[PDB]
Write a protein that holds these residues in place. Structure first.
Motif, PDB file in Angstrom:
ATOM      1  N   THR A  36       0.842  -1.197   0.000  1.00  0.00           N
ATOM      2  CA  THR A  36       0.000   0.000   0.000  1.00  0.00           C
ATOM      3  C   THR A  36       0.876   1.246   0.000  1.00  0.00           C
ATOM      4  OG1 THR A  36      -1.744  -1.131   1.233  1.00  0.00           O
ATOM      5  CG2 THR A  36      -1.801   1.227   1.325  1.00  0.00           C
ATOM      6  N   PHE A  37       0.607   2.201  -0.890  1.00  0.00           N
ATOM      7  CA  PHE A  37       1.286   3.497  -0.945  1.00  0.00           C
ATOM      8  C   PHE A  37       0.351   4.646  -0.527  1.00  0.00           C
ATOM      9  CE2 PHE A  37       3.452   0.840  -4.239  1.00  0.00           C
ATOM     10  CZ  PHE A  37       4.778   0.941  -3.796  1.00  0.00           C
ATOM     11  N   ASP A  38       0.760   5.462   0.441  1.00  0.00           N
ATOM     12  CA  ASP A  38       0.094   6.708   0.848  1.00  0.00           C
ATOM     13  C   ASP A  38       1.013   7.912   0.610  1.00  0.00           C
ATOM     14  OD1 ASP A  38      -0.880   4.771   3.682  1.00  0.00           O
ATOM     15  OD2 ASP A  38      -2.275   5.291   2.080  1.00  0.00           O
ATOM     16  N   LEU A  39       0.483   8.997   0.051  1.00  0.00           N
ATOM     17  CA  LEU A  39       1.201  10.249  -0.193  1.00  0.00           C
ATOM     18  C   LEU A  39       0.743  11.341   0.785  1.00  0.00           C
ATOM     19  CD1 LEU A  39       3.217  11.789  -1.986  1.00  0.00           C
ATOM     20  CD2 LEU A  39       1.415  12.069  -3.637  1.00  0.00           C
TER      21      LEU A  39
END
Lengths: 55, 44
Positions: A36-39
């Motif tokens: 999972t990628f969060d910015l």
């Protein structure tokens, strides 16, 4: 006649082992959450002492 | 919250309180006039 995979990723320690053989169906990986990628653009990077190092 | 994989919920409320004791003809003394009264327990 069996599939051999040389482990080229740098994980292997040749001073511990040369070869591992197995029944790979008896080894199981549970994926609880896929990569999972969060910015983020607000908030802080902080030290273990709770000092701010990047705002 | 970012670096320790967490969220937070904030609740906020803003409020004022007034008990209004106008001047009465019967008790003009501010120190003893009041619009409420209480029964307290016995003893100390």
């Amino acid at each position: 006649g069996f599939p051999l995979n040389e482990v080229t990723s740098g994980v292997w320690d040749a001073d511990e082992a040369i070869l591992l053989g197995a029944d790979w169906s008896k080894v199981v990986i549970g994926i609880r959450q896929d990569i999972t990628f969060d910015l983020f653009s607000e908030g802080v990077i902080s030290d273990s002492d709770g000092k701010v190092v990047l705002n | 919250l970012m670096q320790q994989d967490s969220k937070a919920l904030r609740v906020v409320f803003r409020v004022g309180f007034q008990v209004a004791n106008p001047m009465t003809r019967l008790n003009p003394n501010e120190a003893t006039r009041y619009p409420a009264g209480v029964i307290i327990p016995a003893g100390g």
